[PDB]
C-alpha cells in the first residue's frame, strides 16, 4: 500500500526515463544520484519534483542535499513514516557504516572516452 521499494525503484525509474530519459530496469537502488545517473542534480531535481508529487513524499532540498543514493532517497521517505527502523533497503554492514553496494574486489581498472 505504502511507498515500497519497487515503488521508489520502479515508480522513480519510470520517472527517470522521463527526465533523464534513462531506462526503467536500468535504474537500481545501487544508484548514487550522480555517480550513476551522471545527470547531475539538474534532472534528478525533476525526478523528485515528480515523485514528490505523484505520491507526495517528503524530500525537500533540506533532504535532497543529504540523499546520496536511492536507499537514502527512500529511507528519508519511509523512515519519515515508519517502515524499517534500521537504516533502509540496502544497508548490509553496520548502520553508520552504510554501503549500498557490497563491494568484494578491487578497482582502478576502468578507463574513459573523453571528447
From Swiss-Prot:
Keyword Lipid biosynthesis: yes
Any GO MF annotation of the entry: acyl binding
InterPro entries for the chain: ACP, ACP-like_sf, Meromycolate-ACP, PP-bd_ACP
Keyword tags: Cytoplasm, Fatty acid biosynthesis, Fatty acid metabolism, Lipid biosynthesis, Lipid metabolism, Phosphopantetheine, Phosphoprotein
Domain Carrier: start-end pairs: 3-81
Compartments reported by the entry: Cytoplasm
Family statement: Belongs to the acyl carrier protein (ACP) family.
Official protein name in the record: Meromycolate extension acyl carrier protein
Annotated source species: Mycobacterium tuberculosis (strain ATCC 25618 / H37Rv)
Amino acid at each position: 500500500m505504502p511507498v515500497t521499494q519497487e515503488e521508489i525503484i520502479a515508480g522513480i525509474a519510470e520517472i527517470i526515463e522521463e527526465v533523464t530519459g534513462i531506462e526503467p530496469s536500468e535504474i537500481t537502488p545501487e544508484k548514487s544520484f550522480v555517480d550513476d545517473l551522471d545527470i547531475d542534480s539538474l534532472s534528478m531535481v525533476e525526478i523528485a519534483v515528480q515523485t514528490e508529487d505523484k505520491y507526495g513524499v517528503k524530500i525537500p532540498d533540506e533532504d535532497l542535499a543529504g540523499l546520496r543514493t536511492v536507499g537514502d532517497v527512500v529511507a528519508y521517505i519511509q523512515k519519515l513514516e515508519e517502515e524499517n527502523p534500521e537504516a533502509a533497503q540496502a544497508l548490509r554492514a553496520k548502520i553508520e557504516s552504510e554501503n549500498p553496494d557490497a563491494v568484494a574486489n578491487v578497482q582502478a581498472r576502468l578507463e574513459a572516452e573523453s571528447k
